[PDB]
RNA sequence: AGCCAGGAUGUUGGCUUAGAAGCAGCCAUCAUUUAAAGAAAGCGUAAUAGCUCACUGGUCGAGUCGGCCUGCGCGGAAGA
């Protein structure tokens, strides 16, 4: 599980998730798993999907996780009233918008990249698509 | 048979048929591949 | 031979007679005789040289048991008779386990012409060196 | 070797461009050299199947606008974020 | 797409081969007469074997195959 090594403040406000994404082209690799839905992704979903990919295209290839969590999500325990402070940091999510290339892959044929990205897009909560490295 | 909400062709003899508004997978090779309700 | 009518191919190293541990009733399930691997088969084995299994066609007729003629020496123990260690291949091609001189394969390939596919010497030369590719046997050029 | 038939955009801004992409076209511009920049509207499907090739981004293109021919080169393409379609293309004269 | 034909040899390739002789195993994964063929893609064995196919010929006489972008729909869908 991914999590920043050392923050600056422990608890972040909710804020909103509007507009489109910045990481949009397949930059590092050759094939990409790009988001279409909005959503947000916990570190467990990123790890689950990465294990599905790494298993699927065996220890050949090279995989880039282009998103990183760095946003702490706090929850209140059970049978605790409202108020009395902000909750506790339970997990860490990355906020996703439509357009984020969530993962990249290189060093495989396209048909294995289709296969691993299908296998791993079923571990994520957002609708997802397959993209290739377009040249300009 | 298997009532699932994803019905798929598990074999190359499996065959998707819609009967009475129900998607089904009829196989001839293996009757374990018989499925309903996709 | 004909349509498949009770002929199979099975034994182990035929320096001895009638292998009881390895196969046994595998040569007794069909109409193939138990006795005709013991005396007359070794009578037809001593015509060239012993110490080789023979995958052979045994066409069981309405005669006593059958009639048999051994035809070809197979290339498994012919490519194991001088190859390297006596244990086996395992993973032979990713390293250098065996090595075979190609002149003796040119003369054995020049001998064997019944149970092959080829009409030229060079056409069937590297086929048996394809069996050297099988057990990882590095040919010495 | 590519010939891309174009028209001149009499309207511009985000209203007119988004109206222009719902009608299965997309805006573009031809700038470079000493001339004024030229606002251009392009059919979408022709240019999309055309840019699926690699030579679209390397070879000299020819754009036919008002019965002229401007030999341009595809400078920079804005693509839609999550759909296989185009927002806009910058064409530098050549 | 149907229908009529062919689809092998070293190849028991050695296996920890107790039986694997393409079939509970791993490395290999070659080369040829040949339009064409995998040391076997599916089943299958006490065990070879048994078939079908991957590919090619004939019959057939006009479309067919699979992706993409989309509109509307189907299933997923159980409560007093």
Swiss-Prot record, chain A:
Family assignment from sequence similarity: Belongs to the universal ribosomal protein uL16 family.
Any single Gene Ontology cellular-component annotation: cytosolic large ribosomal subunit
InterPro entries assigned to the protein according to its UniProt record, in alphabetical order: Ribosomal_uL16 (IPR047873), Ribosomal_uL16_bact-type (IPR000114), Ribosomal_uL16_CS (IPR020798), Ribosomal_uL16_dom (IPR016180), Ribosomal_uL16_sf (IPR036920)
HAMAP family, A to Z: Ribosomal_uL16
Residue numbers carrying N-methylmethionine: 1
Keywords, comma-separated and alphabetical: Hydroxylation, Methylation, Ribonucleoprotein, Ribosomal protein, RNA-binding, rRNA-binding, tRNA-binding
Name this polypeptide is given: Large ribosomal subunit protein uL16
Assembly and oligomerization: Part of the 50S ribosomal subunit. Cross-links to the A and P site tRNAs. Interacts with assembly factor DarP(YjgA).
GO terms of biological process kind: cytoplasmic translation; ribosomal large subunit assembly
Lineage: Bacteria, Pseudomonadati, Pseudomonadota, Gammaproteobacteria, Enterobacterales
(3R)-3-hydroxyarginine PTM positions: 81
UniProt modification remark: Is hydroxylated on Arg-81 by RoxA. The modification is nearly suppressed when E.coli is grown in anoxia.
UniProt GO molecular function: rRNA binding; structural constituent of ribosome; tRNA binding
Role played: Binds directly to 23S ribosomal RNA and is located at the A site of the peptidyltransferase center. It contacts the A and P site tRNAs. One of the last ribosomal proteins to be assembled in the 50S subunit. The simultaneous presence of uL16 and bL36 probably triggers ObgE's GTPase activity and eventual dissociation from the mature 50S ribosmal subunit. It has an essential role in subunit assembly.
UniProtKB/Swiss-Prot annotation, chain C:
Stored HAMAP family: Ribosomal_uL11 (MF_00736)
NCBIfam families (UniProt xref): L11_bact
Coiled coil residues, start to end: none
One Pfam family, short name: Ribosomal_L11
Keywords, in A-Z order: Methylation, Ribonucleoprotein, Ribosomal protein, RNA-binding, rRNA-binding
N6,N6,N6-trimethyllysine modified-residue sites: 3, 39
GO cellular component: cytoplasm; cytosol; cytosolic large ribosomal subunit
Similarity section: Belongs to the universal ribosomal protein uL11 family.
Identification of the protein by name: Large ribosomal subunit protein uL11
Gene3D superfamilies: Ribosomal protein L11, C-terminal domain (1.10.10.250), Ribosomal protein L11/L12, N-terminal domain (3.30.1550.10)
GO biological process, one term: translational termination
Curated annotation (Swiss-Prot), chain D:
Database matches in InterPro entries: Rbsml_bL25/Gln-tRNA_synth_N, Ribosomal_bL25/Gln-tRNA_synth, Ribosomal_bL25_short, Ribosomal_L25_dom, Ribosomal_uL5_bac-type
Classification via Pfam families: Ribosomal_L25p
Keyword Ribosomal protein: yes
Coiled-coil region(s): none
Gene Ontology CC terms: cytoplasm; cytosol; cytosolic large ribosomal subunit
SUPFAM superfamilies: Ribosomal protein L25-like
Record bears the keyword Ribosomal protein: yes
GO molecular function annotation: 5S rRNA binding; structural constituent of ribosome
Keywords, alphabetical: Ribonucleoprotein, Ribosomal protein, RNA-binding, rRNA-binding
Any GO BP: cytoplasmic translation
Function: This is one of the proteins that binds to the 5S RNA in the ribosome where it forms part of the central protuberance. Binds to the 5S rRNA independently of L5 and L18. Not required for binding of the 5S rRNA/L5/L18 subcomplex to 23S rRNA.
Family statement drawn from the similarity comment of this UniProt entry: Belongs to the bacterial ribosomal protein bL25 family.
Subunit annotation: Part of the 50S ribosomal subunit; part of the 5S rRNA/L5/L18/L25 subcomplex. Contacts the 5S rRNA.
Name this protein carries in UniProt: Large ribosomal subunit protein bL25
Species classification: Bacteria, Pseudomonadati, Pseudomonadota, Gammaproteobacteria, Enterobacterales
